[PDB]
């Protein structure tokens, strides 16, 4: 029949590698999953179902079940929006909103904005990998232990709140150019903060964090390499775009977004392209010389967007163009989005103007709120 997946999640601690994603892709492509005789004997298939958002798995001898039958489309949110704890609110208070913009783009490209600031700890998309990452730790790593990572600002905040709710201590490392909220808010939340005014980037800090890890023995959760980041976005962000698009009546032709770790947009593109491989992924390339907070250029070794069978198209965006999009979204929708969000809107507008996109509905993932970036806002005004 069906069994509750929550009983089988130790496969998250034992499955390794990307091969399980073949099952994920096929179940999503076909719209259904085959019965697992002994579910414990097919740990890859079980992880595949978890990662696409199933809450139930098919077991025993018997027939295949559809995505809907596996819970992929179940409603989690209580309609009255009352929650017994902050973590329960994070988990069941989903999806994040998907809102049609009044901003007009060329060639029949209709914009919808997915507002990831609607996450309770960091007011950003980074809550999701923080929760998934800390959760995966929490029965191999003893309480009281120190966990740490490098961050542009958002993950550090998320990691600080979530580490403490799970009984861990945290430390976050930031580059000198990070926003003030990233430097300060983790201390509010009880974490240690190290700012390296030398470091020109978040990734530039990773050798130092690794070395301190070896010396001091804290757990480096490494969001740039930890697959729980990608997994969080498969079951959360990406599934939601899929479910929201079907249930909302959208003619989904593409998603648009930005890349730091590449975690959220790799998941969105991977998930959606499993269901329909023509769905586009338009991704921001910050123009050379420019810094758009939280994000960076593909070249390098970002993990998932390169290693996974993902189709995408890049558009160059300058910081000035990104902030101009912030301005225009604000004046069109009354919504105040962050620079990376503006950059994504602009990348979609550019591809739309070139004639490269089928008319239809396009989802832009807006990683956070522009309230956090006042000095960039001021510059953009003049
Ligand atoms: C790497 C981080 N942030 C990613 C981020 C991103 C990129 O998201 P992914 O790491 O999932 O690629 C986009 N926009 C903003 C405002 C962000 O903070 C961090 O907060 O450490």
Swiss-Prot record:
Cofactor: pyridoxal 5'-phosphate
Gene3D superfamilies: 3.40.50.1100, 3.90.1530.20
Pathway terms, separated by semicolons: Amino-acid biosynthesis; L-cysteine biosynthesis; L-cysteine from L-serine: step 2/2
Example GO molecular function: cystathionine beta-synthase activity
Positions of post-translational N6-(pyridoxal phosphate)lysine modification: 126
Temperature dependence of activity: Optimum temperature is above 90 degrees Celsius for S-sulfo-L-cysteine synthase activity, 70-80 degrees Celsius for O-acetylserine sulfhydrylase A activity, and 80 degrees Celsius for both cystathionine beta-synthase and L-serine sulfhdrylase activities.
Enzyme nomenclature, EC number: 4.2.1.22, 2.5.1.47, 2.5.1.65
Keyword Mitochondrion: no
GO terms of biological process kind: cysteine biosynthetic process from serine
Keyword terms: Amino-acid biosynthesis, Cysteine biosynthesis, Lyase, Pyridoxal phosphate, Transferase
PANTHER family cross-referenced by the UniProt entry: CYSTATHIONINE BETA-SYNTHASE (PTHR10314)
Subunit structure: Homodimer.
Family, similarity comment: Belongs to the cysteine synthase/cystathionine beta-synthase family.
Protein name: Protein CysO
Annotated organism of origin: Aeropyrum pernix (strain ATCC 700893 / DSM 11879 / JCM 9820 / NBRC 100138 / K1)
